[PDB]
Write a protein that binds this ligand. Structure first.
Ligand code: CO
Ligand code: CO
Lengths: 189, 189
């Protein structure tokens, strides 16, 4: 069974929190690759002024081009939204029967797994990996694998807020991505 | 007065934990400078090979170069043997009575404040700044200024450990610093 880690999110924009987690679990659990699964844009959701999936893909490409082991998974973008993880993992599970997928989540999403659609069936399809800081233990009734990580508490929403409020983004996400954001004036301006 | 930030530590090695913190608080509280104040490490009697103040100072200089607003304070390295924060601030206060220092510490270090040497006197010399993840509150009996930050839970000790057991260090500390570590074989050979 090939071990491939999956990291979901909007990647609007992608940041060192995404890369840090991918690299850590990739090593801790000896995975083959880690795939970044962009979310499809939700309906009604920002049918206003927001990033096109096209720009997210570009930044995501800028952020992962230097790693042969990190690749993009357009599975959720292949269908119209919203995207349920279960349905999504069902498909990757039929396209890649030789793979034991590891769905990776931040320490704080763990308490919300009960609200995920079909979580019990989903736990049959993939093996959940929860990321936590040294010594802190993840509590949940679902089987999860914990991987101690020098966690970076940055997020795409914090980054979007900051680009508008014209705040600092230093050390938060890849420079190449930052250049992309400014050249195209995303969020900022 | 001109407000200056202070971050103490071994910086053995200096890492992105430190830089992020200084840049986050430098912007949050509008400081005009942040000072990196390296501690003096005494010789472990049961014998333990530790980095020379020489190379640690070079590592500190490597990670501090590019930032005009980041400097090294050599006050603790000027005394023989490690000194208490109180004593160091007594000297910095009298040496720069025009400055109001902001001693920056990790939110998780906050609870241990009551056990600090002369903390009652220290509270009047400097202004404590506790750094924490957004939303988290800093329970403490002392008047601390809290600043929400996308906290990077990396530590010098966690690093010395990755290098020894040959674990990954990616995104954990600056490029130049790793280059210097690899050469002189600081935590390996
Ligand atoms: Co700035
Ligand atoms: Co590696």
């Amino acid at each position: 069974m090939r071990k491939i880690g999956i990291i979901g999110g909007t990647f609007d924009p992608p940041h060192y929190g995404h890369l840090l987690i991918a690299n850590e679990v990739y090593h801790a659990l000896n995975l083959e690759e880690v795939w970044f699964l962009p979310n499809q844009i939700p309906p009604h959701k920002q049918g206003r002024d927001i990033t096109s999936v096209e720009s997210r893909l570009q930044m995501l490409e800028l952020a992962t081009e230097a790693e042969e082991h990190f690749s993009i998974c357009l599975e959720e973008l292949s269908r119209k939204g919203p995207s349920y993880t279960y349905d999504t993992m069902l498909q990757l599970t039929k396209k890649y029967p030789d793979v034991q997928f590891h769905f990776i989540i931040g320490g704080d999403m763990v308490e919300y797994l009960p609200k995920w659609y079909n979580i019990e069936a989903l736990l049959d399809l993939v093996t959940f990996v929860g990321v936590a800081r040294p010594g802190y233990k993840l509590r949940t009734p679902y089987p999860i694998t914990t991987v101690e990580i020098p966690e970076f508490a940055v997020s795409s929403s914090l980054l979007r807020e900051r680009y508008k409020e014209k705040k600092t983004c230093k050390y938060l996400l890849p420079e190449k991505v930052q250049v992309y954001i400014e050249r195209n004036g995303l969020y900022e301006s």
